[PDB]
């Protein structure tokens, strides 16, 4: 009856036709029908992203490929629970009061300044979304934006609009690149390839400070916007009060614990997973110092994304098992074998990043670092690089509304059309392509 | 804990077939690609076959196409290799290894990379028997080495299959000997030498002689070197 | 992929190094293999660097590009063997050419001695002419088989040793294999041989009785 | 400087004191350290009983009980996502105005009287509280019998109010009691000693059947109410519609396979945990059905909960791995060998149902249930009958405020004292021990 | 704990059944065990009542309080052995006092003998005299060492066989071992024996020489 | 896979010491119980003492409290009951079991209850030695059934330890024979009787001679049964 509906039952049609028709060995057959049902539902979205994730280890079982519980433990993996721990500083940071009271910090220094202040509010943004969300600090933004723009004109200068609410996005949706935290995809790539949080920042944080300046820069030359005149916000003035600086302290450690994780996990007795077990610490130190309480843990953070995290490692193990990834690596192999490297961190680039336009970030990464990843374990390739790399591209969504929600949140105002967002992301996103492959080719080395 | 067993390794004719099996214990086959790594005859290492059997995904060698053929059934443990249209110039030490691929984030007894071989089966492409290892002495030239020494030899010439051991003077002289590695022949016969050091002075007041332990056609034979 | 160099003489305590150049710039694969003569190649490296679990810290990877290479710091006596690298791409795999690293010496003047055939090879109708090199260094010996300034490209055998365990030095035995009636027409029988410790290539020519 | 945080201070100063003055073996001290520290931090609830829960695995890994994972894998138990799917059919069944039409169709039975509209209030909020939840239930009824009651007198005759209210209330706890779903003691005892859900109503519908009217009947007595009137309602009735009945095959369809589970198990192909599947596939019925959006599921269901599952279940295995369940037992031995059975069992159903009146259900259970089913593992005593005891009981909360929220959401109106329900629970909770008493040496034959 | 019938006289495809009392109401970790003579003992059933993994259906168990149970329904030939329960209460373990099953059979008629001892006996200083019964039924003979009217209690030994392979019967041999003169200064030896295949209690007398 | 393997028993003067030791594998001590069960000499199970280690928690029986003590190091697997005080009703075949309790919830080699035992170490507490296994003739009386079956016997007087083998006429009588299970005597000597049954006319064609093996002390004895 309704759409979705049919897409379902469209791809139930397509999965059984391939688990009947596709004459291979059963179980690269029956993980080619599950990659491809799961495929369409986490790309067009027919259920909810989650739903998919809990239907992956259903089909799992009900074809014997694992037993029921070694199937729900991918729902349970450090990488969730360190996700867990950024959700928490993001609600007690949040509910403390700590990111407005820095964005205020920020934008006084730039007295009055316009000109300034809007870079200020990139850099800002890049700086919490890092941490708190892709979509909150948007959102906790667009406001600012707005009392910063409130002097200036809508239709006749709204060029500077476009400039102000397109940077504050975009930035938001690259300063998830720089921590595993900031955005879901980071975590889906670092537990498909076992990743700490300072062996991903190593790829995550300069190709922030690497593509947020790139962005910018092609905002003010695509739009020549008036960004000259003054400054006046109203709103009561924030300071600093205690709860706030505990805050800051209890961030500040957590984040010393994860960076120099692998010095003191040596001089603490060498445990697996150490920066789970401190973001668990930053939980409990919260809890304990009472900054934040546990309902807003649980009204804030997306279990879903959780869940998801569980239903794409489930992916990947089923991939793993059933052989399907050395099936395709073994068919593709004369075409990977002409095509260097250099040409197939392109390709994957380009096709993410114009993919995650039309798609979600979440979703697609979910899909495809399960598959990228297994297919390069198999061509002998690190899945480390085509993960991270399908994992900092799943985020440039600068095309068109949402494909993130940050770019719906800002054309909501409709101070922005939606041709100028074609036009900038689709020069973004091919300067984006370059930038990726770049510093990929260059970390390969 | 963990081990492959190679078997089905032996002679044959060219034109021919044979089929080697590769018994594993301490992981599963289902779990990790099975790799068939001929050696040479005397050569390096040289790579033949795989297989995936958890998706019956095999690669051969560019080498061996039409002639070969990999497989593999769980539930015991196995990785057959069936060599057929063997030619002459696929003697060798086939190996049998394991590389584990997807590291399996759970766990696993997997390896990484070839970790565990094995032992290895010989095959040797066959074309004609009945060479028993006939002896050959050496006789150091009568103008040999003055105040010096001078070395001396028996010949092992046309036998067949490894090994054939040649000792001088039933153990009584393992000092300057060389046992050369034995040597294919034009006509498919191996032929050695064995050689032992000696100064010039004491070689008369000795007899020397070498055992030609050959257990195929189960010979022994003993050659007096006696200069005239 | 092509491994190099092919053969490396190096003494213990050295640092020796070793490339392998792969031509698929797809699969960072590479490992590493010890072979000890006729057993089972034993691994040291698996992806391209990492160490495996029951090896010494002295043999270590790198990657840089596609240009793979190995390094042992400190050469042991018991780290002479043959080297290789393997690099999988999907499913099928590769070796290097074989690199082969022995224990170096001092010059070493090959003691070269040449054989006649016995009686008994003139009745089956060949003869095995032997010319030995014993105790002389690493391989460099091409036995000239020269006769009547005649050579007989094709019918010249040679069989080396490995390296001795005592003197760490190379015995060779090349063979003239002939027939019965060309050995009867020809009396004169001699191999030049040439090394780096002979500064003229000696010949030991004889006649037959 | 807080009055928990004194607590916890206290309670890691005991924990020391303990690890360092306990003389034993150093796993049975760290076992009973923990196990003291725990507890006193799931009683008084200083921290939230979550964050306790994820400080187990932090106490099992920092002092090397666990590797990370296996103990993170906690969190995973296939109970925890039955319970999961009890919460999705609790949000599409409220969502969509099932619950809420449900007790309108069964109230309009009783045309206009009262006399046996609380009967049926009591009867539907224990049909509902087996699935929906404890607190939902009761704050949804206690609007219906505000309602039922706005007819009659709040000061003259009080004693109407406190029995419709207290009926509804110890119906909600009650009901919990009758499946797995319901409440999470019976969750935390299944997962502890692996039960089914139809070898679990085994023991909780027979006992919710037979003290939900005993209860119904010590209030009829020790109150003397006036519940003869006639009933007026005024809400705009509500009627089926699609959607809900759409709802109700899904949910009646996914209890048929809870109920029979083994004999479709095995004609399937025998799955270990095909009841959780049951429930991934009441999500997945769901919401390809359109009635419920995860949205709602993630809105509604108690997170909180399915983390302590994990973390009672993490304290669980470290009660096992350091041997001091053992320890104890062997120390208890005497004492047990001359207390027979019936003695023990009346010991812990009076300990734990004079203890929730204290603490919470939930917390109380995650803490008993691991300790006395180890101990009861060590005795060679079967720990299903002591968990399901001791998840059967600890939902016996009828004394006081807190102790469960039904108690204190009806004690929010003020129509009820607290003195009434001190004895009208205290002589429920004896009457409770009696029945969970016999009914246990019932089930040991 | 206490476990009942001591011996079962049971026929194969018989069905057979064991109690065993417990006598500590807390611990259903009964488990119940088949021992072989001289063998470890098998386990059947563990907790009370629930199988084991490579054990036969027809082992079945129950608890019915502290009366727990064991139940062979069809009696094979290889099940003919010795049945243990054990309880588990905390770390210690208490085992019953022991169930043999025998495969049983009609009366048979003890054939029962009087021996001497021998003249090398009577230079050692001791006299053993053996009274032997072979091929009977299950165990009852109170072997009745009888003398001039004189019992000797304490100085009579027993020794029995298992239960034979081919007709399955026992064999008894009893044995007074008596002293020198206490041997030399009586003449008449006698031992009765009871069994349900003897109305009258046989005695075997004899005199030395 | 798993397996018990029980060392250390052997002879042993009462008032003494002895020291039993349990290897396994297949599993880990740290999560199990283990459990030391002396049979009897010629009786029934009976349970002497119990440890688990990851607490050190030992329970003994009431019969061996000042007199036994249980331990276990961990780190290769063992269980180590040191006998002390050992008395003449001590005597026995010391088994060694594994008890799992708490079924771990995710994965073990565990087994619930007593499955994996072993072989047993016999103890024999000890007196006094050089007993050698003397022989004794049993004479089929002279008046014999007639037309019917007399039994007659060996009798293996004053031996020690087991076992003792007593075949008679060198395995040409195999049939009617009954090797009884050995006695122990009031003073510590074992005692046992071998006979055989045969009709009473076939008693005087053939000698009937049975043959004494005993090991420990080297006995080899044949005593001829000859009636008067
Ligand atoms: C994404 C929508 C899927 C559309 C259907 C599709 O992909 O076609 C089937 C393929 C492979 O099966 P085949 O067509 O090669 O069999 C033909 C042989 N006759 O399945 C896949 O490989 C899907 C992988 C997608 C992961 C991104
Ligand atoms: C619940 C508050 C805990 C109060 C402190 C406490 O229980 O005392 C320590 C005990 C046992 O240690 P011990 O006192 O026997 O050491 C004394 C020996 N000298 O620890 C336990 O057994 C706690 C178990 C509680 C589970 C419900
Ligand atoms: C506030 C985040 C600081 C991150 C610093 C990273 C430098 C390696
Ligand atoms: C609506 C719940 C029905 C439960 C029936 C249980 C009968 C065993
Ligand atoms: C065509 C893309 C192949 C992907 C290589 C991992
Ligand atoms: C005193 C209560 C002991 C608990 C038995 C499990």
Same mark, same amino acid.
């Given at each position: $009856? ?86 928490? $500083? ?294 480390? $690089? ?60 | /804990?963990?081990?492959?067993? /190679? ?94 691929? @997807? ?74 000997? @060389? ?34 332990? @050959? ?10 070197? /006696?200069?005239? | ?209």
């Amino acid at each position: $009856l309704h759409r979705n509906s049919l897409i379902v039952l469209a791809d139930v049609a397509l999965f059984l036709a391939l688990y009947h028709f596709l004459p291979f060995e059963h179980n690269v057959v029956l993980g080619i029908s599950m990659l491809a049902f799961i495929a369409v539902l986490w790309l067009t979205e027919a259920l909810h992203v989650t739903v998919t994730a809990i239907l992956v280890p259903v089909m799992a079982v009900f074809f014997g490929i694992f037993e029921t519980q070694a199937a729900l433990n991918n729902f349970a993996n450090s990488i969730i629970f360190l996700f867990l721990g950024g959700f928490a $500083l993001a609600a007690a940071m949040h509910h403390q009061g700590l990111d407005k009271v820095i964005a205020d910090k920020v934008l006084a220094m730039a007295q009055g300044k316009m000109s300034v202040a809007v870079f200020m509010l990139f850099g800002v943004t890049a700086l919490l979304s890092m941490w708190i969300s892709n979509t909150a600090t948007a959102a906790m933004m667009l406001p600012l934006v707005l009392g910063v723009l409130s002097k200036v004109d809508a239709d006749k200068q709204r060029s500077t609009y476009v400039f102000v609410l397109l940077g504050v996005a975009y930035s938001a949706s690259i300063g998830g690149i720089a921590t595993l935290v900031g955005s879901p995809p980071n975590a889906i790539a670092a537990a498909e390839v076992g990743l700490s949080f300072t062996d991903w920042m190593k790829f995550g944080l300069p190709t922030a400070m690497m593509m947020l300046p790139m962005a910018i820069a092609i905002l003010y030359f695509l739009l020549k916007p008036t960004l000259n005149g003054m400054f006046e916000l109203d709103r009561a003035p924030v300071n600093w009060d205690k709860g706030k600086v505990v805050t800051l302290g209890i961030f500040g450690l957590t984040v010393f614990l994860w960076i120099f994780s692998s010095p003191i996990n040596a001089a603490l007795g060498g445990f697996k997973s150490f920066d789970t077990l401190v973001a668990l610490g930053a939980i409990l130190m919260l809890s304990f110092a009472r900054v934040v309480h546990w309902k807003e843990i649980q009204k804030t953070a997306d279990w879903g994304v959780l869940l998801l995290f569980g239903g794409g490692l489930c992916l990947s193990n089923v991939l793993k098992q059933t052989g399907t990834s050395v099936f395709l690596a073994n068919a593709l192999s004369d075409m990977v074998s002409h095509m260097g490297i250099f040409v197939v961190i392109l390709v994957v680039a380009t096709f993410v990043v114009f993919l995650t336009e039309f798609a979600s970030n979440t979703a697609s990464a979910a899909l495809l670092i399960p598959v990228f990843a297994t297919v390069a374990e198999a061509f002998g390739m690190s899945p480390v $690089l085509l993960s991270v790399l399908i994992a900092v591209a799943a985020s440039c969504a600068f095309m068109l509304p949402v494909a993130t929600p940050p770019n719906a949140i800002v054309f909501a105002s409709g101070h922005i059309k939606q041709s100028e967002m074609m036009r900038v992301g689709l020069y973004l996103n091919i300067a984006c392509i370059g930038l990726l492959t770049a510093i990929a080719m260059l970390f390969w080395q | /804990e963990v081990q492959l067993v /190679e078997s089905g390794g032996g002679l044959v004719q060219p034109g021919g077939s044979l089929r080697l099996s590769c018994a594993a214990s301490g992981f599963t086959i289902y779990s990790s690609s099975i790799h068939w790594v001929r050696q040479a005859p005397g050569k390096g290492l040289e790579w033949v076959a795989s297989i995936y059997s958890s998706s019956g995904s095999t690669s051969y060698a560019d080498s061996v196409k039409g002639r070969f053929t990999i497989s593999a059934d769980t539930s015991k443990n196995t990785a057959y290799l069936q060599m057929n249209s063997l030619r002459a110039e696929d003697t060798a030490v086939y190996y049998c290894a394991r590389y584990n691929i @997807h590291y399996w984030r759970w766990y696993n007894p997997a390896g990484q990379a070839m970790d565990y071989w094995g032992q290895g089966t010989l095959v040797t492409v066959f074309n004609q028997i009945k060479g028993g290892p006939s002896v050959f002495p050496l006789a150091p030239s009568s103008k040999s080495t003055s105040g010096g020494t001078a070395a001396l030899g028996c010949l092992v010439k046309d036998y067949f299959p490894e090994p054939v051991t040649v000792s001088w003077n039933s153990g009584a002289l393992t000092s300057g000997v @060389h046992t050369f590695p034995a040597v294919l022949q034009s006509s498919g016969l191996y032929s050695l030498s064995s050689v032992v050091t000696v100064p010039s002075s004491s070689l008369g007041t000795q007899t020397y002689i070498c055992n030609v332990n @050959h257990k195929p056609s189960n010979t022994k034979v003993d050659k007096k070197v /006696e200069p005239k | 992929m092509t491994q190099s160099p092919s053969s490396l003489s190096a003494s213990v305590g050295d640092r020796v190094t070793i490339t392998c150049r792969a031509s698929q710039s797809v699969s960072s694969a590479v490992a590493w293999y010890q072979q000890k003569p006729g057993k089972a190649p034993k691994l040291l490296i698996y992806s391209a660097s990492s160490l495996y679990s029951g090896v010494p810290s002295r043999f270590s990877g790198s990657r840089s590009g596609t240009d793979f290479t190995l390094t042992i710091s400190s050469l042991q006596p018991e780290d002479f063997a043959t080297y290789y690298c393997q690099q999988r791409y999907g499913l099928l795999v590769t070796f290097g050419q074989g690199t082969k690293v022995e224990i170096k010496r001092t010059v070493a003047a090959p003691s070269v001695f040449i054989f006649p055939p016995s009686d008994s090879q003139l009745k089956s109708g060949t003869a095995s002419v032997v010319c030995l090199l014993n105790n002389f260094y690493p391989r460099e010996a091409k036995v000239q088989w020269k006769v009547d300034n005649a050579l007989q490209s094709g019918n010249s055998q040679e069989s080396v040793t490995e390296q001795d365990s005592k003197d760490s030095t190379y015995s060779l035995s090349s063979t003239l294999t002939l027939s019965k009636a060309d050995y009867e027409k020809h009396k004169v029988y001699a191999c030049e041989v040439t090394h780096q410790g002979l500064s003229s290539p000696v010949t030991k020519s004889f006649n037959r009785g």
